[PDB]
Design a binder for these strands. Structure first.
Ligand SMILES: [Mg+2]
Ligand SMILES: [Mg+2]
Ligand SMILES: [Mg+2]
Ligand SMILES: [Mg+2]
Ligand SMILES: [Mg+2]
Lengths: 348, 93, 64, 113, 274, 93
RNA sequence: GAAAGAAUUAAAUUAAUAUAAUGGUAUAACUGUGCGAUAAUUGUAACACAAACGAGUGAAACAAGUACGUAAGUAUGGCA
RNA sequence: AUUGAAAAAAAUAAUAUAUAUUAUAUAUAUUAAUUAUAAAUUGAAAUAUGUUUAAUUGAAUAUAUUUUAGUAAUAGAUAAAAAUAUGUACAGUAAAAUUGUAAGGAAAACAAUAAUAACUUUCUC
């Protein structure tokens, strides 16, 4: 009985609720489900017949399979293979399935869904692929944030942004949203959730928010603008919210300048990109990198060139898009930016 | 649980001796009645069935009695006999 | 005459009205279009009266 | 309104139709839902295993046949030729019946023809 | 409409966007029909299928043994022939159609452990021709089919028009039902045991019957349908009764293999084989 | 001229809400010609049936194992081979 | 080695397109289905094509409102 | 909440209530419905109140109050039978010819008829 053992196995694989666990594992269908909170509703409810004995048999079967997998898993040396074996062992565990399905994945509590555990991480990845990743990809393609900034994306990390400091309200930004200048007045907060097996201690990350749609009237086209630039950020599967708490002033290659779209300049895409650092062998600890702060410019910014220079690989992305409103002038005034231009309504 | 109602009106004609026996064999569902608490919800009935639950329908002239699957040969453990296992493939050794 | 002309008069009592063509025994033609006097989409209805090919009102309530 | 034949047709139609004959939807609790999932998944796995076992057995049989026929070809050409014939109109014998739920009164017939 | 020009734009990523999942319109429809949470749920594997079990145990190995031909290579079917490039008019020319046929024919593979012939599907086509006069006859035929199978029939409509036979276009006329898996197996077992012995003078399914590739068929008269136990139990409920065609579809490469398979399930075969 | 049942307005089955037709079926025991019982699911309400003419008593399905009848019945006292030999002079033809 | 999926390749526009004939159409313009029934809406329409004038044709954009779509967007009647 | 059975909580989504913000958000509670809709001196069922049989429950029967039976097709995002011919969203592929099959025949309906290299997941030697 491998799934009852918790000597070597993490605590997160168990259900933390006692009542739920008891309901799952009983000898007869006597008890009533903890999910149904109300007495009358519990009375009304009737579970399907014979479900217990069969369930028990299924558990035994899959528990045996898990145990067999574990016999292989411990003998394995290379890490990715071992992780895959661990996943195979525990993915069919009812308790871990309960934990994952019916508790929040975004702000996961460590005791319930631990992303340090390989199985839970795999589940989270699968969940991301099912909806959120596809949506992100659609928003990147439709809005034309991929070819315009950075050729392609192979989504690996789930990136979610927030604007807590400006207004007060709590809301994770859906990709391709129209945010007010009040909302995006102060800086955002990232959460880079990584689902691949990666060296947590060594692996650093960079985050770049880029505005491809600021108008350049000499060229009669647009230019990019690095609105916010962080480097050498340390992520951990559970500890992953990039906040002023975590990153230092040394990490900020270009400190947050807010979206201030001009009147009739149009809708401006702000597409955050998340890259992971190149990992160097034969060097213990996190390998930093120095950025030439005079070389990179904010008013015009070759993202692709920058990536080429520092050998980055874009793992994640997110996007919002701002256009002119009444408060952009106020935002400019607060930041000490100039009055702001006004363009002709006609694109002649 | 998911099965439909048995359409008794088709198989048994109204006002017939065969229907009457079937009706006697059956027991009906408890209908909703005003001024009463039904703590297992109010009865949802159509064609005389509680929609919320599984339905049970109880049913020469001779009872069909099947023969025993285990045999005399099996009981005795006669290896030379062909009737000794009926559910398995026997091979001549 | 197979297709007749009719006058659809705006329901928001501006006085604005739009004209359309229909078959002689077509159902009463009401449509929602922009009324520029009111500056919104409003119902238009037939100002005049006329005879219609009487269809049997299809019964969803299972009769008899 | 309707004839007796029309009525009987309507009744017949009703027998087939889902109109007012079907129960409520099978709702489950989350724990119950999980239990169901674990039952189904395990079953599916078991079925796959069984399929592989049977498939493997068939493959093994095929390999054995191949091994036999090569040997036959090597040794006795006539015997090999006899073995490897077109069995186009081969018919299973009518005595090899599909096994019933329960056995008959006379289990086995000792005399024939 | 400003234009009718259809032109799908290329993309800049290899992620496969399932558009159905991004909507919030059909939440019940996002679940698979196999899943318990879907209203489309049905218990599939309710009991052990008997004919299928028999096939697995006894027949499949025997069939494999029968079909072994030593060092048998693939027989390619009739395909679309390319032009020899002996003229510059061959350069963007469509390929010559197949030799005998207009349509391409499939390759016949050697039978191994993977591709042993087995039952794939049964289809019970009942087109009642008196229903050109009476629509109610189509309904009765459909009910009969349902009774026989325990499966939901689909209505057949008159696809064509013709004056000689008093037939309109778009008129409900009989019904069909594709049986698959366990219900199909049961239906075959009933046919073998109950119905086809009660036909008095029946030699068998013809050996000249069938597709070129793994499909065999036959038909039952209105007299023959009265032997089905759902029909058989009550003569009185069914005054009228309709014949039917029975298309058996196998996983057989050729038709003789399919015939052999059906024989394994106690179907007699009488005529002179092709 | 064409006899029909005229259609009412069809009931809108919403997408996702379509439910599979699970007809009411009883487990029915068929005893064949010999005592071999077989269970089959059936829509008609009859728990047991016993069959007279099956594959298990048909000569086509087991080769190894009523005017004439009427005639035999009503010419039984006479007992009608010897009779053939008596009544078969092959001179006249 | 097997099962399932994603599919790709080949072929096809000979069917079908409310309607002639021609061009186009599977990336479908063809067909099915949900919602809808709105854009078979309101003021300015540059610029082109065509063009003796009178007319005719395609139409970016600006402004008001509407319908569908998670979104991107699409709709100022119909593949032309 | 009362009723049955033998401290709590940690998703999505929906619903109810509240408030945050020139952000259709968050918090707490709960998981309903899901193929229905008027009209039935006649069928069927339940419950209540009586009476008789073997305090008791079953069984039978009377009245009252209800409930069911109006029996009708699509069960699938249906996909070349017929039907809403303009919008939008999602998805799919036709035809011919050939081989067959109960009446069926040149001509009614149904079935079948090009290739899997590589890729992902699952089981397995
Ligand atoms: Mg053309
Ligand atoms: Mg010109
Ligand atoms: Mg001019
Ligand atoms: Mg069109
Ligand atoms: Mg058109």
């Amino acid at each position: 009985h491998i799934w009852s053992d918790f000597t070597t196995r993490p605590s997160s694989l168990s259900i933390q609720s006692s009542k739920v666990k008891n309901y799952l594992f009983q000898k007869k269908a006597s008890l009533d489900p903890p999910s149904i909170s109300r007495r009358s509703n519990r009375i009304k409810y009737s579970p399907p017949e014979h479900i217990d004995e069969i369930f028990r048999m299924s558990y035994d079967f899959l528990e045996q399979r898990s145990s067999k997998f574990y016999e292989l898993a411990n003998k394995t040396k290379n890490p990715l293979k071992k992780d895959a074996l661990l996943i195979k062992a525990e993915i069919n565990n009812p308790e871990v399935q309960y934990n994952f399905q019916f508790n929040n994945k975004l702000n996961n509590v460590k005791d319930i869904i631990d992303y340090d555990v390989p199985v839970y991480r795999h589940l989270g990845k699968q969940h991301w692929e099912s909806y959120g990743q596809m949506l992100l990809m659609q928003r990147l393609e439709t809005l034309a944030a991929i070819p315009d900034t950075l050729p392609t994306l192979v989504p690996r990390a789930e990136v979610n942004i927030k604007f807590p400091f400006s207004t007060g309200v709590n809301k994770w930004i859906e990709p391709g949203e129209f945010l007010s200048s009040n909302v995006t007045s102060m800086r955002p907060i990232f959460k880079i959730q990584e689902y691949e097996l990666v060296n947590v201690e060594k692996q650093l990350y960079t985050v770049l928010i880029v505005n491809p749609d600021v108008p350049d009237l000499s060229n009669d086209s647009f230019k990019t603008a690095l609105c916010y630039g962080l480097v050498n950020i340390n992520l951990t599967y559970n500890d992953n919210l990039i906040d002023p708490r975590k990153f230092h002033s040394s990490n900020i290659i270009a400190d947050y300048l807010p979206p201030v779209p001009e009147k009739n300049a149009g809708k401006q895409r702000f597409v955050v990109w998340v890259f992971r650092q190149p990992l160097i062998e034969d060097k213990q600890g996190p390998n930093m990198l120095e950025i030439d702060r005079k070389e990179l410019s904010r008013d015009d910014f070759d993202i692709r060139q920058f990536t080429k220079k520092y050998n980055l690989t874009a793992i994640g992305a997110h996007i919002w898009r701002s256009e002119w409103d009444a408060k952009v002038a106020a935002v400019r005034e607060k930041y000490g930016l100039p009055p702001g231009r006004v363009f002709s309504r006609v694109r002649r | 649980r998911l099965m439909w109602t048995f359409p008794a009106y088709f198989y048994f004609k109204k006002g017939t001796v065969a229907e009457h026996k079937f009706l006697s064999l059956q027991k009906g569902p408890i209908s909703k009645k005003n001024g009463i608490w039904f703590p297992r919800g109010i009865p949802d009935i159509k064609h005389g069935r509680e929609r919320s639950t599984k339905q049970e329908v109880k049913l020469v002239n001779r009872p069909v009695i099947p023969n025993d699957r285990i045999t005399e040969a099996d009981r005795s453990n006669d290896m030379k006999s062909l009737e000794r296992q009926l559910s398995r493939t026997l091979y001549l050794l | 005459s197979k297709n007749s002309v009719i006058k659809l008069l705006s329901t928001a009592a501006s006085g604005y009205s739009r004209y359309i063509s229909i078959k002689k025994g077509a159902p009463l033609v009401t449509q929602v279009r922009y009324d520029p006097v009111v500056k919104r989409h409003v119902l238009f209805k037939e100002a005049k009266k006329r005879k219609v090919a009487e269809r049997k009102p299809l019964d969803f309530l299972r009769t008899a | 309104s309707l004839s007796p034949l029309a009525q009987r047709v309507v009744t017949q139609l009703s027998v087939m139709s889902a109109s007012r004959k079907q129960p409520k939807l099978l709702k489950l609790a989350r724990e119950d839902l999980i239990k169901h999932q674990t039952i189904e998944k395990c079953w599916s796995i078991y079925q796959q295993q069984q399929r592989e076992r049977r498939n493997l057995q068939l493959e093994l049989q095929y390999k054995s046949i191949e091994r036999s026929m090569n040997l036959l070809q090597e040794l006795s050409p006539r015997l090999f030729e006899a073995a490897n014939a077109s069995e186009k109109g081969k018919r299973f014998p009518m005595e090899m019946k599909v096994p019933t739920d329960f056995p008959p009164n006379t289990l086995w017939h000792y005399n024939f023809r | 409409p400003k234009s009718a020009c259809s032109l799908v734009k290329p993309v800049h990523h290899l992620v496969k966007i399932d558009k159905s999942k991004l909507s919030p319109r059909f939440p019940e429809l996002k679940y698979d029909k196999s899943d318990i949470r879907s209203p489309g749920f049905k218990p599939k594997d309710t009991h052990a299928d008997r004919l299928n079990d028999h096939y697995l145990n006894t027949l499949q190995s025997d069939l494999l043994l029968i079909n072994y031909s030593h060092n048998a290579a693939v027989v390619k079917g009739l395909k679309q022939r390319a032009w020899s490039g002996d003229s510059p008019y061959h350069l963007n020319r469509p390929p010559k159609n197949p030799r005998g046929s207009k349509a391409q024919l499939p390759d016949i593979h050697p039978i191994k452990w993977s591709n042993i012939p087995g039952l794939e599907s049964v289809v019970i086509n009942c087109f009642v021709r008196e229903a050109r006069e009476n629509q109610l006859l189509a309904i009765t035929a459909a009910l009969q089919l349902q009774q026989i199978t325990g499966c939901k029939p689909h209505p057949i409509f008159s696809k064509n028009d013709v004056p000689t036979w008093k037939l309109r276009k778009g008129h409900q006329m009989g019904a069909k039902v594709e049986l698959k898996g366990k219900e199909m197996s049961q239906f075959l077992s009933t046919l073998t045991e109950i119905v086809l012995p009660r036909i008095r003078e029946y030699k068998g399914i013809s050996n000249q019957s069938g597709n070129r590739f793994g499909g065999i068929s036959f038909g039952l008269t209105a007299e023959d349908i009265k032997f089905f136990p759902e029909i058989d139990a009550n003569q009185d409920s069914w005054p009228k009764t309709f014949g039917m065609h029975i298309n058996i579809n196998t996983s057989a490469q050729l038709d003789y293999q399919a015939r052999t398979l059906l024989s394994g399930f106690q179907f007699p075969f009488f005529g002179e084989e092709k | 001229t064409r006899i029909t049942l005229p259609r009412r307005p069809a009931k809108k089955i919403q997408l996702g809400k379509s439910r599979p037709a699970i007809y009411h079926q009883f487990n029915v025991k068929m005893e064949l010609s010999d005592g071999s019982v077989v269970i089959r699911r059936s829509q008609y309400p009859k728990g047991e049936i016993r069959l007279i003419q099956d594959q298990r008593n048909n000569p086509l399905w087991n080769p190894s194992r009523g005017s004439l009848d009427r005639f035999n019945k009503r010419y039984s006292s006479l007992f009608s081979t010897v009779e053939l030999s008596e009544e078969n002079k092959k001179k006249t033809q």
